[PDB]
Write a protein that binds this ligand. Structure first.
Ligand SMILES: CC(=O)Nc1ncc(S(=O)(=O)NC(=O)C2(c3ccc(Cl)c(Cl)c3)CCC2)s1
Length: 167
């Protein structure tokens, strides 16, 4: 039993809610919240901009130190950093950005990072300003993630389309 409430069950291990990931993280304080990161951990917009804003830019400060020490992530890769006021940990995961011309096949590799964590609050990878088809992202999620994932979708219109098209 966990504290995630108001989720539709899609499969044995995948759940989906119409919720702002920022507010869901603040409410639940999950062990892991996933960020829709880029390789430079520059949290300017989309999910990342919103999560970082909610940390009062502390996520960005921590991220800049991480990059100065370690260099950029790989597309499809991830790192674990602090969750600040939102979660114990933040798993920064880099899905491919279609608007940069990046390989959509890397989406499966990106979701594989979730399997290193027993339970996660997450957005759909490569959705929104990353330019992928969110229905495809949900399919890859369900077919790749084996741990317990709670997906938060802000847009009600999108959420209903995701539910109504799910096989
Ligand atoms: C604060 C914040 O951004 N919180 C998020 N939680 C979850 C998400 S998301 O990754 O599911 N993206 C979305 O819902 C979209 C969206 C459409 C319209 C608006 Cl107004 C917003 Cl904010 C987001 C982008 C693709 C639909 S963004």
């Amino acid at each position: 039993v966990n504290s995630f409430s108001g989720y539709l069950k899609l499969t044995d291990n995948v759940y989906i809610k119409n919720a702002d990931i920022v507010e869901e993280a603040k409410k639940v304080k999950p062990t892991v919240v996933v960020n829709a990161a880029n390789v430079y951990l520059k949290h300017g917009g989309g999910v990342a901009g919103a999560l970082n804003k909610a940390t009062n830019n502390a996520m960005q400060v921590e991220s800049d130190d991480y990059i100065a020490t370690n260099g950029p992530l790989k597309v499809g890769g991830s790192c674990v950093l602090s969750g600040h006021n939102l979660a114990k940990h933040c798993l920064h995961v880099v899905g491919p950005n279609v608007n940069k011309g990046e390989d959509i096949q890397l989406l499966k590799s990106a979701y594989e990072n979730f399997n290193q964590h027993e339970v996660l609050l997450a957005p759909l990878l490569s959705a929104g300003i990353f330019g992928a088809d969110p229905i495809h992202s949900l399919r890859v999620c369900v077919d790749t993630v084996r741990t317990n994932v709670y997906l938060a979708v802000f847009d009600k219109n999108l959420y209903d389309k995701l539910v109504s098209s799910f096989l």
